[PDB]
Symmetry: C3
Subunit: 382 residues, 3 copies
């Protein structure tokens, strides 16, 4: 939730999430779900979004209904912010543990500093069980195993209640006497010195000394109880390993790209050159989490969110085997209610009417090439 | 105009504009002139100029004597700011349309954010005709063809005059009575409440209600008249395609570079190694829009501004065919009044006495190699 | 001095200084000492240190006990700040001239803007002689040879004394009369106009006119005496040539890296793959200026500061010739008091417990390969 309201061109021109898998659709409490996939950083990064020099891989959900057990970018655990390069592709994996029952829309997201949220496709996952069964065991380097759900709760309650009680007692010591009107009149009359006695001064001195001594003793006792402590671990982790992918033996030029403004579709003229890899055929156009597929060339079998999957939303004028070398100019039409449901038609309000997306080409043997396209998008009103 | 006053080293060390062409020297009104060329970004970019992450290709002229019909960087239209990389070469093309008659010095420039203006060579172009014949037709996506010279002029005049008249009427309603002295005396005397009557309150209420209602009705009518509107299109366009140029089979090292301070020339010792490409010969040294040529090796036939063209300003101690492999140390002398006219001799006031420029080598067949040189420049006073 | 107090991980993860040489250990006054070596910029640059876009090569010493005659980065003189790229290796050379007698700990350092100091290994150098024998001759472009120790000293003294005397005379002219109490009483009594006479006004006018005229005449005389002047030369020098080094035919993966917190050592599990270059053997681990060596494989003969040299501080479970192709998992133990002396054990207070260093592999013929390792460092308390 939160993507439909984001500018259409910003969603089109930031990060592209390609083949994704979810290990389970329905999980029990304390069971783990794995979300893996690839994300590509668009070369034409918008200028109002800072470069992903400081980026964090996040899980979009209405709260800690899951707990993120681990997250890996390129096989490396990433508990901190990371640095990503423009134009590179990265594998990502996220292992989550179920905490609260219910149906949850879970998304993979990249939070970018100086940019904001970049939400990926969301999937509905059902958690069955009771929240009381959730456990979060962690073993420390000191040899102690604790449960993070209730660890250190009683100590915090005790100390906060103790200090609150001390403050309440300090206020109530003075609250046993007339408070506001008689004291104000006495101060106005010049009898302020009569409002504080020697016993009050002794009580204040005792309160101050007891507070300081208790703080010192509590710090000493806490140090004795936990002689091994480390500061909070923070920093930006550089040197993320990107994917070394086969360059596309397929070249695609966008002649024109238009959308009818009333409109639930997008149309584009494309010149495609096959540089080998056998006769190929376009099977899918990915724009903003929406996948328009050509049923005759490719069929999704990964449980891609159906609200974002158009099984026959790709209409190519001529989708015949493009013999290696053939340069065919084709008119592709990406049509689906998701265009209007995911407010991609709101590119009419955007201060930049340019789109970007991914095209997937398959040969007879099923090998897939990914081609990256970007162009300006012209609205049609006649 | 405006380059002679810019620091000499800043002009030497920012952008180099090489082979340029102008389609016409004399044009009529509504006729188009094309300026094409190449620009190279110097690797040793000055630190006080921000990197050209946000750069705009501009035309330097005393105003809209021309209208910039289009501009292309690397074959791509660039109506917005663009991103350029240090050390890369780009083709540029600018098509302008003549608007006002007269002789105009036209320059190609790169405005760089956090840096300032980078002016290129200027050429004198004559426009013949009358300004009243200039037309700027534009066809909108709604099917309307308009002339940008006078489009929406009457509407703006009408609305501004209407609101100015309303304000004048509001002031003049109160201006029919004594204004300053009697009213001031009455307010001082305590008779302020007598200065505003019930009729005045009713008039003020009517003015407020009429203003609000007129604004609302005008907005509704404007929306009805123009139901299709888009916001201003802005942004920085990345992914500019640079030139893939042959690396210079010629290696040049600058041993020493000196200039006499009184002085109208510059001298340099150079070690040149030919790595193939047949016997070569230096034909031209480009510094800051000034081209020093060796008449025996090369002759300009592009109509390069004569104030910046020194046909025999390159004197090479030995400019004989440098057999592939020969490593000759030569003393080159670049001499021309342009050195003093374009205030390149003002490098003596610069907080950085280092120069940069381009050397052009030609073989027997006429093939040209471009070598890029940079060195510190030492003034000579004895 | 000043490195032991710097965070251990910051010292481990910034710049690595490898093979270094000092021309002399004991020098006389006016004699020169050359310090050469290589420095590598770590790829995982810490986020709290700005990238070395503006870096200066500096000499760490308690003052001008030496004078830095020259400094070269990649064979190019670097009197100004320079730009360095992450992940590149550079040669550096520094020629210093002895000025003051005594024993001096001299370090090579890289000052990085927005980062702070990066100190390299320090060496003790003895200077014998008298400071009065030190000379700093410099020949100007005007044909004058001067000594920078005493040049322009007398002129500065004369002008400062002259202006101070003028100010003292101005104060003392008024100081001959009663100063504070009688004047205050007269001003309070309303007799302020009697405290300044016409002669005082004439004296003030003469002082003002003389000051302005003297300033103008002094400027004119200084211009006449030195008709050739240049502004201060400043700027950041880009285009530093890095080393083109053989990629390591040796691959090393860090399985685990741990340190006992009481502790004077560090332990690591490593998987090493030989990709040719004959049977190899680990001979040295460089962490933070500390070099742990395996005496049986390599011996230092460069006079590396002994406080930072552990001749037998590298213990490899199996350090037998790793036949090209062999993938051996070995347990290496780097032990030395320098770990505690140079406060590398203070990584326990660091907000980032990750280390980086260099491994040196030698074959039978003595050829050396440098492998770069980085990992998180886990403290052991049991
Ligand atoms: C829950 C209260 C709201 C917020 C409390 C915030 C800070 C505390 C303020 C007052 C503390 C001192 C009590 C008054 C002097 C406590 C005090 O003096 O009690 C005797 C009073 C005074 O004697 P008197 O002049 O002969 O009688 C006048 C009132 N009948 O008599 C009483 O019968 C008791 C009345 C006082 C009861 C108020 C207690 C509520 C405060 C404790 C709340 C603790 C929880 C805090 C978080 C919400
Ligand atoms: C690092 C330097 C210290 C900071 C400088 C200021 C220090 C001030 C000193 C007092 C100067 C005022 C004159 C008072 C003369 C001595 C003095 O302390 O008198 C009591 C004064 C009231 O002043 P007075 O009676 O008119 O003074 C005349 C002689 N008694 O109250 C206080 O000082 C505050 C309340 C009583 C203090 C008891 C200790 C509790 C507070 C400290 C914590 C102790 C427990 C430590 C935990 C381990
Ligand atoms: C061009 C004027 C300069 C700038 C104007 C700026 C804002 C407007 C100020 C005054 C408007 C109300 C007029 C006075 C009450 C208009 C008004 O009350 O007119 C009757 C006056 C007053 O009657 P009275 O007391 O019996 O006579 C005294 C003056 N003789 O009599 C007149 O004979 C007319 C004199 C007033 C003429 C001034 C008009 C100029 C202002 C309109 C300019 C519009 C263009 C604006 C942009 C420049
Ligand atoms: C979103 C919330 C609204 C903002 C809150 C403030 C609103 C204020 C309300 C009035 C409170 C003061 C008491 C007045 C009582 C009602 C009232 O409006 O009285 C007239 C008052 C003068 O006060 P009064 O006579 O002593 O009031 C006693 C009873 N009449 O003048 C005004 O309110 C201003 C001038 C007359 C207003 C006429 C409408 C023109 C202005 C609004 C635009 C209407 C056209 C819309 C275009 C589509
Ligand atoms: C070294 C002094 C410290 C700093 C000086 C800073 C600025 C100068 C202040 C005073 C200058 C005017 C002198 C007084 C009027 C100089 C002046 O009027 O001298 C005659 C006085 C006054 O005559 P009187 O009323 O009959 O006698 C009263 C004092 N006996 O008599 C004297 O016997 C001389 C006393 C004055 C000597 C003070 C001189 C010190 C100042 C010069 C220092 C220069 C070095 C500067 C850097 C440190
Ligand atoms: C660029 C524009 C200049 C700045 C504008 C202000 C200039 C002010 C002028 C004076 C106006 C006040 C009326 C005084 C009338 C003329 C005048 O100068 O009178 C003397 C006034 C005192 O005023 P007054 O006697 O009541 O004036 C009545 C007629 N004399 O003192 C001063 O002006 C200051 C002290 C005397 C000046 C002598 C010259 C020394 C200062 C200047 C440097 C000269 C040497 C140059 C070196 C090459
Ligand atoms: C959450 C836990 C709540 C803690 C509650 C603590 C109690 C707080 C205040 C008690 C007020 C009694 C005032 C009696 C003066 C009532 C009073 O003033 O009585 C006259 C005495 C006469 O004493 P004397 O013998 O003639 O002279 C002194 C030596 N003999 O004067 C005084 O000066 C008596 C001073 C006594 C002050 C006691 C207050 C100390 C409170 C510290 C509390 C510590 C916090 C808890 C620790 C875990
Ligand atoms: C650029 C175009 C210029 C537009 C010029 C607009 C004219 C402006 C002001 C007229 C002043 C007349 C004042 C008469 C009070 C003169 C006045 O006060 O007369 C006494 C009346 C008595 O009226 P009554 O009948 O006894 O009671 C009300 C119901 N019957 O009192 C009032 O309260 C009369 C109020 C009348 C106010 C009229 C002003 C409205 C002006 C709106 C202009 C709209 C803008 C143009 C639209 C395109
Ligand atoms: C470090 C070097 C130190 C320099 C010391 C300079 C001496 C400073 C002040 C002298 C005070 C004498 C005051 C006499 C008034 C004492 C005074 O006021 O005497 C009455 C005269 C009467 O003169 P008169 O003839 O009747 O009228 C004028 C034409 N004839 O009035 C005046 O107005 C006299 C004005 C004389 C003022 C002289 C002060 C000029 C000082 C400039 C110094 C230059 C700096 C050094 C250059 C290298
Ligand atoms: Cu959602
Ligand atoms: Cu992409
Ligand atoms: Cu010009
Ligand atoms: Cu260049
Ligand atoms: Cu030291
Ligand atoms: Cu390194």
């Amino acid at each position: 939730h939160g993507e439909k309201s984001q500018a259409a061109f910003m969603r089109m021109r930031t990060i592209h999430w390609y083949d994704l898998s979810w290990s389970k659709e329905k999980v029990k409490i304390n069971e783990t779900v794995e979300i893996k996939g690839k994300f590509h950083v668009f070369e034409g990064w918008p200028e109002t979004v800072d470069e992903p020099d400081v980026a964090f891989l996040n899980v979009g959900m209405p709260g800690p209904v899951f707990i993120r057990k681990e997250s890996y970018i390129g096989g490396q655990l990433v508990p901190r912010s990371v640095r990503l390069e423009i134009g590179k592709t990265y594998d990502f994996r996220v292992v989550l543990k179920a905490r609260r029952p219910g149906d949850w829309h879970v998304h993979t997201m990249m939070n970018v500093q100086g940019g904001g949220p970049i939400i990926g496709p969301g999937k509905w996952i059902t958690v069955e069980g009771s929240m009381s069964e959730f456990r979060n065991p962690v073993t420390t380097l000191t040899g102690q195993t604790v449960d993070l759900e209730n660890y250190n709760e009683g100590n915090t309650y005790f100390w906060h209640a103790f200090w609150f009680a001390i403050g309440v007692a300090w206020i109530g010591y003075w609250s046993r006497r007339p408070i506001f009107i008689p004291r104000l009149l006495m101060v106005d009359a010049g009898r302020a010195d009569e409002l504080v006695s020697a016993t009050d001064r002794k009580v204040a001195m005792g309160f101050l000394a007891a507070t300081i001594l208790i703080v010192v003793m509590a710090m000493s006792s806490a140090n004795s109880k936990y002689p091994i402590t480390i500061p909070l671990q923070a920093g930006t982790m550089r040197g993320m390993k990107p994917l070394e992918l086969p360059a596309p033996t397929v070249s695609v030029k966008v002649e024109d790209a238009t959308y009818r403004v009333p409109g639930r579709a997008m149309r584009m003229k494309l010149t495609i050159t096959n540089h080998g890899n056998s006769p190929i055929r376009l099977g899918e156009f990915y724009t903003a989490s929406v996948r328009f597929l050509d049923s005759d060339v490719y069929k999704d079998t990964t449980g891609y969110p159906e609200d974002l999957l158009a099984e026959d939303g790709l209409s190519v004028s001529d989708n015949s085997p493009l013999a290696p070398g053939e340069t065919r100019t084709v008119d592709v039409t990406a049509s689906d209610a998701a265009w209007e449901v995911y407010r991609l038609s709101d590119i009419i309000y955007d201060p930049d009417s340019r789109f970007a997306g991914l095209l997937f080409f398959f040969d007879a043997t099923g090998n897939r090439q990914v081609v990256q396209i970007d162009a300006p998008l012209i609205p049609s009103f006649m």
